[PDB]
Amino acid sequence: GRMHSAGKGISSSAIPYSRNAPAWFKLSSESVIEQIVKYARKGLTPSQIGVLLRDAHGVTQARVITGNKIMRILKSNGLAPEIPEDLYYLIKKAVSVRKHLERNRKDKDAKFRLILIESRIHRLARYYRTVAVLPPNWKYESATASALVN
Amino acid sequence: AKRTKKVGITGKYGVRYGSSLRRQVKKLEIQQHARYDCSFCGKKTVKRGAAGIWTCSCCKKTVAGGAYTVSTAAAATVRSTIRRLREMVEA
Amino acid sequence: STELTVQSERAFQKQPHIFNNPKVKTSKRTKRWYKNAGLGFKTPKTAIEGSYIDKKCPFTGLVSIRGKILTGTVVSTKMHRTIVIRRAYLHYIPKYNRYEKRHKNVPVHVSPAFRVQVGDIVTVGQCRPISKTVRFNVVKVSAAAGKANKQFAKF
Amino acid sequence: VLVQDLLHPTAASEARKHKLKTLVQGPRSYFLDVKCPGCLNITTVFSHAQTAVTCESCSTILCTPTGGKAKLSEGTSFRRK
Amino acid sequence: GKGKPRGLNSARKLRVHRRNNRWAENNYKKRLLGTAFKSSPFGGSSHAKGIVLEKLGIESKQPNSAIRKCVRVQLIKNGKKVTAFVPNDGCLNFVDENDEVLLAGFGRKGKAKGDIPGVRFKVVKVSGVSLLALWKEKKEKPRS
Amino acid sequence: TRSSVLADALNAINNAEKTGKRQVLIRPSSKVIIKFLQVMQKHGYIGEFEYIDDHRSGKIVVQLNGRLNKCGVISPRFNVKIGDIEKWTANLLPARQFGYVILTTSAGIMDHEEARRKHVSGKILGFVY
Amino acid sequence: MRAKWRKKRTRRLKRKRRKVRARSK
RNA sequence: GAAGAUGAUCAGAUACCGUCGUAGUCUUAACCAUAAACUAUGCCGACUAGGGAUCGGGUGGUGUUUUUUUAAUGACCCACUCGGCACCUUACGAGAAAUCAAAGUCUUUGGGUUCUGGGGGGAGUAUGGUCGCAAGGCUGAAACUUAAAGGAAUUGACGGAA
RNA sequence: GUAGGAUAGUGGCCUACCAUGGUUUCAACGGGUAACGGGGAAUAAGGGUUCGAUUCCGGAGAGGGAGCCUGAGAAACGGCU
Ligand SMILES: [Mg+2]
Ligand SMILES: [Mg+2]
Ligand SMILES: [Mg+2]
Ligand SMILES: [Mg+2]
Ligand SMILES: [Mg+2]
Ligand SMILES: [Mg+2]
Ligand SMILES: [Mg+2]
Ligand SMILES: [Mg+2]
Ligand SMILES: [Mg+2]
Ligand SMILES: [Mg+2]
Ligand SMILES: [Mg+2]
Ligand SMILES: [Mg+2]
Ligand SMILES: [Mg+2]
Ligand SMILES: [Mg+2]
Ligand SMILES: [Mg+2]
Ligand SMILES: [Mg+2]
Ligand SMILES: [Mg+2]
Ligand SMILES: [Mg+2]
Ligand SMILES: [Mg+2]
Ligand SMILES: [Mg+2]
Ligand SMILES: [Mg+2]
Ligand SMILES: [Mg+2]
Ligand SMILES: [Mg+2]
Ligand SMILES: [Mg+2]
Ligand SMILES: [Mg+2]
Ligand SMILES: [Mg+2]
Ligand SMILES: [Mg+2]
Ligand SMILES: [Mg+2]
C-alpha cells in the first residue's frame, strides 16, 4: 500500500461484471475506434482519451466496446509515444521538481520527494526494459530529461 | 583523474600556511575564479577583474560587486531593502 | 565464416594433413575436412562451408567431445575464441531443509562456426584440456529469438 | 451472528456496503441521457463525469466536475442510462 | 513472519545468521578463539606439574572466616605462576617450599571455587606421592 | 504483500472455526485452495463450499460444520521424499489414527494416506485435523 | 553513580589516553 | 543564559536561590550525525469484537437553517461508506504480570522480509580501520571477575507525599 | 590465440609474437587452524552438536630444502650429490 508513503487507501475503479456491455450503446466499434484515433491525432494520452470517451460519449470501457485496449489501438494505428505514458508523466514531475530545486536549494523535502520520484522512475524503467517496451540500456540521466519530455 | 583529495586550488600552496588558512582561502579562490552568469546577456561569462570589478566577456559589460563574488549577501539585502523603500515611497 | 583474414598469424593456418593438390584442379574449391561431433550435435553449415581453421573446433578441428555435456548462460565473450559461461545451480543444506543459489564460471572454447554473445544459452561438451582453464567446447547455441526483435525504435 | 447466508446477502446490506466490499464488486455510477433546454439532441454523460461536458452542437456546459458526482447544470434535463 | 526468513532458497541467510549469532555463546567463542591455548594457564590440559614457590594463606571471602592454605606454583611447561589450594585438613605440612606438585583444576572450568578468592587450581600430588594417600596414612613422602 | 493465498484462506477458516461460525468467505480463491478444500471436504472437515465468480480471482464461501481443529499451511512448500512423510506426520499431526498432511504431488494435490497408497510424494502444502 | 556522568568520566579518560598516546607516538 | 563574576545561607562550607554576564540562543555558507531520536512496540499482507466520538472525502434524505405561494450554494442534523489520529467496554485469545484489538490468529508451534539479543560486570573499554577541523561518530574485543544482576506483582515498613 | 619447445602425453607446462583478459558480496584475494581428507565415532524423540593423529582407502613425508642416478615404475632417502 503506497510504495513511497504510508497511506493505505483503496480508491480504485470497480469495473462491472459484464465483459460485453452495456446494451444502450448504439454506436459501432469502428466509430469508437476512429474517435479514439481522432483524439490521438489531437494529441491525447490514452487516459485522456478514455476519460473523454467515458464522459462525453457513452463508451464505458473501450476494451469492452471494442476488442482492444486504448494503447493497443494507438499502437495498431501508429500513435504509440517513444516512452510510455506513466513513465513520461513521472519524468515530467521529476524535471518540474528539479527545476524548482535549482531555485529553492534549501528545500530538503523537495530533495527527498525528488529522490522518491527518481526511484519510482528507475523501477518503472527497469520493468519496461525487461518487457522490452523501452530499448535496452535506456537510462534516465536526469540532465537530458527536460528535453526528453520537453 | 582526481588529482587531489581536498586541497583543490590550494595545492599550489604546498604544505605551507596552515590547513585552516588554506581551507579559508580555498573557499574564496573558488569563488573569485568561478564563471558567473551575466544578468544582461544570460551567458556564464562573468569573470573578476581586480576585486569589485566583474566583467562579462560577451557584451563587454562590467558590474561592481564583492571582492570574491558578484553579489554579496549584504548587497542583495540592500537591493531588496531599497526596492521595498522605493515601492513604499513611490506608491 | 568465409572472410575476415584467416591467415592473420605468422604461421600458415591450415588443417593438418589436408592436401590441396595444385597439379590437378579439384572439382570443389579448397577441400575442407569436417566431422559430426556425435551425440546428435549437428555440424553447422558455417563449419562445413567456412574458411576458418580453429584446430580446437569440435567439427573442423582435432578435438573430440566426450564426457559431460553441460549448459550455461554466456557471461563473457571478451576473449578470442573462448567464452565464459555461468552455470547457476542450487545447493541443498540439509540442516535447514533449504537451498542456496550458487554459480560456477566455466571457460569454454567457442568455434567461429558459432556467433555467441552475452546472454545466450549454450550447450558445451567436455573435450581434452584446450588451455589452462578450458576443458569444454561450445557444441550448440540455444538462443534464436532472445526477445531482441521488438526493442528497436518506431515512427 | 455466528450463522448467516453469505451467498445471498440482503440488498439493503449490499447497497450499504462499499463498491469493492460487496459479494461481487461493481460500480455504483451510471450514465445519463441529458438534453439542454435549447438543443434537441441527447448527450450521454457519466455520473462522476470529471469533465465540463458539452454537446457536439451546443456551446453549453452540461455538467461541472466535482469531488464525486458531476453537477448537472443550468436547467438541463436528464434520464438514467 | 516470526523473524527469520523461511523460503526454500533462503538457506545461506539462515546459515550465516546462525554462524554470526553462534559467537554469543561462551563455549563456542572460547573454542574458536582458542583461548585455552592462548591463556588459561594449563594450555588446554587437565593437569600440570609445577614447582612450589611459597606457601600462601589466603583470607577466605566474607561471610566465611578462615585461612585457606594455598601455595604459589610456577608451572614447568609454561613458567606461569598460579595459586593452588592444598585441599584437606593438614596437608600444607605435607608439601614444602620448592618441590614439585601436580595440579588439577578445581571444579568450575576456571571460576575460582567457593570462598577462596583467586584460586582456581588444586594440588593433587606432591613429589608424585598423592596428597590423599599422604593424608590418610597410605604412603610416605620421599625425602628426595 | 500477499504471498500465500492458501495461507490466507486457511487462516480465515481457522479463525472462523475458532469463533464457531458455520461459514467463511475466502479471497482470492486459487486452484490450490479449491483442491485443498476438496480434500478436506472429502475427509469430512468442511461441508459444501461455493465459488463466487467475480471476474477477477474468485471468492469462496465454505460451510464449516464443526469438526475442524486446525487446518494450516506449511510454508515453504518443502520437498518431501517418500521416506520422510512420516517425520512430517509425527510432527504436525495429533495422532497416528487421524489427521492428514496434504501434499502437492505430481499425481495431484492429496493427503499423505493416498500419497502412500499411490506411492508418490512431493511438496508439502499443510495439514488438516 | 549516574551512567551519564560515568560516561563523561570515561570520555575524559579517552582524551587523556589519546593525549598520552599521541605524546609518545 | 553553560563558563565566569558577585550577594546570601550551610556542619562540611546545599552547585539550589538573587543580580550581572561571555560563548550560545537567531540567520547565511559549510560541517557534525547523536537524543528516554519512545509508542522504549521494524515494514508489507490476511483474518478475528462490540461501541460511540472526531478529522478528510464521497453517497442518500421530498431533514434544519437562510419560511419567500412546490425557500440555490455554504453551515448543521441523520444514516451509510472509505481513509486517518485516537478512545471506551470485554477477554474470545495472549502474557511472568503490568497489561495488549494487538503485544491475538504460538508446544493445535511455518503468510513474506530486514535488523538485533544470549547471565551480570570489565565495556561501548583497549586496539585496528574509517569518517570529522575538532568534539567525537560508525565498527568493536579480550584477559580477568562474579551467583546473581534484572523484570512484574504481593504484603509489610518507611516518606521533609496526599 | 597462433607457432614452437618440452613431456610418456593434454595444457601458459615453458618459450616467441599478439590480444587484455581471468576471479569477486552466490564472499574472490588475504589471515588463522592447537586442520591430513574420507569410510567412520560419541550423544541418540526428531532435527542436530562434537570428534575422526589412530588397525581400511587416498595423499604427503623421511632432520630442512634442492638436484639426480638406475630402473617398467623413485625426484627413492634402511639410493646418491
Ligand atoms: Mg491494501
Ligand atoms: Mg518499499
Ligand atoms: Mg595455446
Ligand atoms: Mg542510538
Ligand atoms: Mg529504541
Ligand atoms: Mg522499510
Ligand atoms: Mg473508521
Ligand atoms: Mg552478556
Ligand atoms: Mg558503537
Ligand atoms: Mg579508536
Ligand atoms: Mg532497565
Ligand atoms: Mg521491580
Ligand atoms: Mg609441434
Ligand atoms: Mg601446443
Ligand atoms: Mg611468454
Ligand atoms: Mg597439522
Ligand atoms: Mg532434544
Ligand atoms: Mg578426517
Ligand atoms: Mg584420519
Ligand atoms: Mg598432531
Ligand atoms: Mg595410510
Ligand atoms: Mg616419498
Ligand atoms: Mg627425528
Ligand atoms: Mg631429508
Ligand atoms: Mg628393478
Ligand atoms: Mg629424498
Ligand atoms: Mg631408517
Ligand atoms: Mg622406505
Short mmCIF file of C-alpha atoms in Angstrom, two decimals, chain B residues 7-85:
data_model
loop_
_atom_site.label_atom_id
_atom_site.label_comp_id
_atom_site.label_asym_id
_atom_site.label_seq_id
_atom_site.Cartn_x
_atom_site.Cartn_y
_atom_site.Cartn_z
CA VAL B 7 43.15 20.90 -1.19
CA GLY B 8 41.88 21.60 -4.70
CA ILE B 9 43.05 25.00 -5.86
CA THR B 10 45.29 25.38 -2.78
CA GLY B 11 47.59 22.56 -3.74
CA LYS B 12 49.78 25.31 -5.15
CA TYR B 13 50.45 26.43 -1.59
CA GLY B 14 52.06 23.11 -0.75
CA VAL B 15 52.27 22.21 2.91
CA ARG B 16 52.65 25.83 3.98
CA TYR B 17 50.40 28.43 5.62
CA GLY B 18 48.29 26.17 7.78
CA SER B 19 45.39 23.92 6.88
CA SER B 20 42.65 26.16 8.26
CA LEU B 21 44.11 29.15 6.41
CA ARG B 22 44.38 27.16 3.18
CA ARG B 23 40.76 26.00 3.57
CA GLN B 24 39.64 29.60 4.15
CA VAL B 25 41.48 30.75 1.06
CA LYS B 26 40.24 27.75 -0.99
CA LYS B 27 36.61 28.67 -0.38
CA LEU B 28 37.28 32.17 -1.76
CA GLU B 29 39.66 31.33 -4.62
CA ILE B 30 36.95 29.06 -5.95
CA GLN B 31 34.52 31.96 -5.59
CA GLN B 32 36.70 34.62 -7.24
CA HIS B 33 37.69 32.38 -10.15
CA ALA B 34 34.25 30.93 -10.89
CA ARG B 35 32.44 31.95 -14.05
CA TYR B 36 29.21 33.71 -13.15
CA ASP B 37 26.17 34.23 -15.32
CA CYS B 38 25.55 37.67 -16.74
CA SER B 39 22.38 39.47 -15.76
CA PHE B 40 22.39 41.28 -19.13
CA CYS B 41 23.04 38.55 -21.71
CA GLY B 42 22.42 35.31 -19.82
CA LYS B 43 25.74 33.68 -20.71
CA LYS B 44 28.00 32.32 -17.97
CA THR B 45 30.91 34.56 -18.96
CA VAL B 46 31.45 36.92 -15.98
CA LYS B 47 35.00 36.91 -14.59
CA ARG B 48 36.69 39.00 -11.93
CA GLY B 49 38.80 41.97 -12.96
CA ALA B 50 40.66 43.29 -9.80
CA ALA B 51 38.24 42.70 -6.93
CA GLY B 52 34.97 44.57 -7.16
CA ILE B 53 35.06 44.52 -10.97
CA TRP B 54 33.15 41.71 -12.69
CA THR B 55 33.34 41.84 -16.48
CA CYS B 56 31.37 39.77 -18.97
CA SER B 57 33.45 38.56 -21.91
CA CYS B 58 30.42 38.64 -24.16
CA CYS B 59 28.77 42.11 -24.38
CA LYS B 60 31.78 43.65 -22.52
CA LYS B 61 29.65 44.91 -19.61
CA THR B 62 31.23 45.44 -16.20
CA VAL B 63 29.39 45.33 -12.87
CA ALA B 64 30.65 46.38 -9.46
CA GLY B 65 30.38 43.60 -6.93
CA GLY B 66 32.01 41.97 -3.95
CA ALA B 67 35.68 41.20 -3.75
CA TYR B 68 35.26 37.50 -4.49
CA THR B 69 31.59 37.18 -5.53
CA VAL B 70 29.45 39.21 -7.89
CA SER B 71 26.71 39.72 -5.30
CA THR B 72 27.40 39.67 -1.59
CA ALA B 73 24.54 38.85 0.77
CA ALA B 74 24.71 42.33 2.31
CA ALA B 75 24.31 43.86 -1.14
CA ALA B 76 21.39 41.60 -2.04
CA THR B 77 19.73 42.58 1.25
CA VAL B 78 20.42 46.25 0.41
CA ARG B 79 18.89 45.77 -3.05
CA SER B 80 15.75 44.21 -1.53
CA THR B 81 15.54 46.94 1.14
CA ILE B 82 15.91 49.77 -1.38
CA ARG B 83 13.34 48.08 -3.64
CA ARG B 84 10.96 47.90 -0.66
CA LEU B 85 11.53 51.53 0.36
#
